[PDB]
Write an enzyme that holds these catalytic residues in place. Structure first.
Site, PDB file in Angstrom:
ATOM      1  N   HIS A 177     -13.639 -13.135  23.300  1.00 51.20           N
ATOM      2  CA  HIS A 177     -14.484 -12.511  24.313  1.00 51.20           C
ATOM      3  C   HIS A 177     -15.474 -13.508  24.917  1.00 51.20           C
ATOM      4  O   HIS A 177     -15.456 -14.700  24.609  1.00 51.20           O
ATOM      5  CB  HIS A 177     -15.291 -11.349  23.711  1.00 51.20           C
ATOM      6  CG  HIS A 177     -14.462 -10.214  23.194  1.00 51.20           C
ATOM      7  ND1 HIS A 177     -14.471  -8.966  23.781  1.00 51.20           N
ATOM      8  CD2 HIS A 177     -13.650 -10.113  22.116  1.00 51.20           C
ATOM      9  CE1 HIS A 177     -13.701  -8.147  23.085  1.00 51.20           C
ATOM     10  NE2 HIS A 177     -13.191  -8.819  22.072  1.00 51.20           N
TER      11      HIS A 177
ATOM     12  N   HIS B  58     -11.682  -7.383  27.866  1.00 46.34           N
ATOM     13  CA  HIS B  58     -12.716  -7.133  28.864  1.00 46.34           C
ATOM     14  C   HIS B  58     -12.401  -8.071  30.036  1.00 46.34           C
ATOM     15  O   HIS B  58     -12.579  -9.295  29.948  1.00 46.34           O
ATOM     16  CB  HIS B  58     -14.102  -7.402  28.251  1.00 46.34           C
ATOM     17  CG  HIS B  58     -14.485  -6.393  27.208  1.00 46.34           C
ATOM     18  ND1 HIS B  58     -15.335  -6.680  26.161  1.00 46.34           N
ATOM     19  CD2 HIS B  58     -14.117  -5.097  27.045  1.00 46.34           C
ATOM     20  CE1 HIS B  58     -15.468  -5.608  25.398  1.00 46.34           C
ATOM     21  NE2 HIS B  58     -14.743  -4.636  25.915  1.00 46.34           N
TER      22      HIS B  58
ATOM     23  N   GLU C  79     -17.009 -15.486  20.592  1.00 45.50           N
ATOM     24  CA  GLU C  79     -17.813 -15.322  21.788  1.00 45.50           C
ATOM     25  C   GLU C  79     -18.195 -16.624  22.463  1.00 45.50           C
ATOM     26  O   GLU C  79     -18.793 -17.502  21.850  1.00 45.50           O
ATOM     27  CB  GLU C  79     -19.091 -14.550  21.454  1.00 45.50           C
ATOM     28  CG  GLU C  79     -18.880 -13.150  20.916  1.00 45.50           C
ATOM     29  CD  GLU C  79     -18.671 -12.142  22.003  1.00 45.50           C
ATOM     30  OE1 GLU C  79     -18.642 -12.533  23.191  1.00 45.50           O
ATOM     31  OE2 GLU C  79     -18.542 -10.952  21.668  1.00 45.50           O
TER      32      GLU C  79
HETATM   33 ZN    ZN Z   1     -15.931  -8.527  25.463  1.00 46.02          ZN
END
Ligand code: ZN
Ligand code: BZS
Length: 375
Positions: free
Chosen positions: A260, A167, A335
């Site tokens: 991420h 992303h 995360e």
């Molecule tokens: Zn992500």
């Protein structure tokens, strides 16, 4: 006064910047998808001793608009020192104010990681003992997808994979990789000595260079969310994922971390594979070990995160679940927060590129500890 975003990872649409006390701006949607949230622009010629009030007017329609609440924008005068600025969120959008000490300053959703730095990172990596560019894939627009392998013993037998930033807007991800790679330059690193005796590292510093360069949030150039393409990769639509899966088949996987960044949750956490039809007692145990060891070493917690998946209900189009199940290996989506890691408050900078790097090095310490349990 002039505002622009004509540079690497830049993103912004200027509405009206004639009145410093009422600057209007809009976030630009991704190249080929409706997603947006990431912003990055530069302001030049600002009047001295003057308050400048900014407003991202379409923040209300961003991909994750509920994540704006509590978020403080980041700014920098030299592009090296980034600091948080007073911000508020309401129906008119995201607002933040600053009385600049300099005539120029830049704002962004998070400390940007440019493709320029990426290149210098790869260069340094290849200058490190036992590090090689094992293979290179190609993005939709033709940018390099380096797969680096760290091998210091011809008899190691485990393959530990770490890929980041599928992303584009989640820049904290590549920062994590920089920290991880740079630790490899230590002369007397006992933990790494043990780890590398038993394993090789497979690293992809950046999974979506086109998206990152074009200041995208979620998708690659084609408009495909890369972390939804693992079940059905496309050589044409999702070449970034297709490349990585071919190499995984060639060498095998015994551990997989997908790095991420989360817009909403102000805590560093890790999502597992508890929803995989292939979620075995062995994997449940390893996941407990991993979190336990990381929690004892880095800025990582286990109280908050995403809701867990019901037995066998995982979405295998996700990297974490797909790889973990396909290879029956420990796998996590790491995360890092766009806000702060509230357990260790540092309001002035919030979560940063530096703290991302440190997490990357702490994760290596965790792997060294678990290396003998993975297989
Ligand atoms: Zn992500
Ligand atoms: O986007 C993210 O970090 C969350 C991740 C799971 C996904 O939705 O792919």
């Amino acid at each position: 006064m002039q505002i622009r975003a004509d540079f690497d990872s830049g993103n912004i649409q200027v509405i009206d910047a004639s009145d410093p006390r009422r600057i209007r701006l809009a976030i630009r949607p991704d190249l080929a998808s409706q997603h947006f949230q990431w912003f990055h622009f530069k302001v030049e010629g600002m009047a001295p001793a003057t308050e400048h009030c900014f407003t991202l007017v379409n923040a209300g329609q961003s991909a994750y608009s509920h994540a704006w609440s509590g978020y403080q924008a980041v700014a920098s005068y030299d592009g090296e020192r980034w600091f948080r600025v007073p911000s508020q969120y309401d129906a008119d959008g995201l607002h933040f104010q600053l009385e600049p000490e300099e005539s120029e300053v830049r704002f962004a959703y998070f400390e940007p990681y440019s493709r320029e730095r990426h290149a210098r990172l790869v260069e340094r990596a290849l200058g490190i003992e036992g590090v090689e560019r094992l293979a290179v894939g190609t993005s939709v627009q033709g940018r390099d997808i380096e797969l680096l392998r760290v091998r210091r013993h011809p008899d190691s037998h485990l393959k530990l994979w770490v890929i980041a930033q599928q992303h584009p807007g989640e820049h904290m991800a590549e920062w994590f990789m920089e920290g991880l790679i740079e630790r490899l330059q230590r002369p007397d690193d006992t933990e790494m000595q043990r780890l590398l005796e038993k394993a090789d590292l497979y690293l992809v510093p950046n999974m979506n260079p086109d998206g990152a360069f074009h200041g995208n949030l979620r998708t690659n150039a084609a408009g495909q969310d890369l972390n939804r393409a693992w079940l059905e990769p496309s050589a044409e639509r999702s070449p970034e994922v297709w490349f990585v899966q071919q190499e995984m088949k060639r060498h095998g996987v015994d551990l997989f971390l997908d790095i991420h960044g989360d817009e909403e949750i102000p805590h560093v956490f890790a999502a597992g594979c508890e929803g995989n039809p292939g979620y075995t007692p062995r994997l449940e145990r390893l996941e407990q070990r991993f979190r336990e060891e990381l929690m004892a070493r880095g800025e990582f917690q286990i109280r908050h995160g995403y809701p867990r998946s019901a037995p066998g209900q995982a979405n295998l189009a996700l990297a974490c679940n797909f790889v973990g199940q396909t290879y029956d290996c420990l796998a996590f989506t790491i995360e890092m927060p766009f806000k702060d890691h509230d357990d260790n408050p540092e309001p002035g900078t919030g979560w940063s590129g530096a703290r991302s790097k440190r997490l990357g090095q702490d994760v290596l310490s965790t792997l060294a500890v678990l290396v003998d349990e993975l297989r």
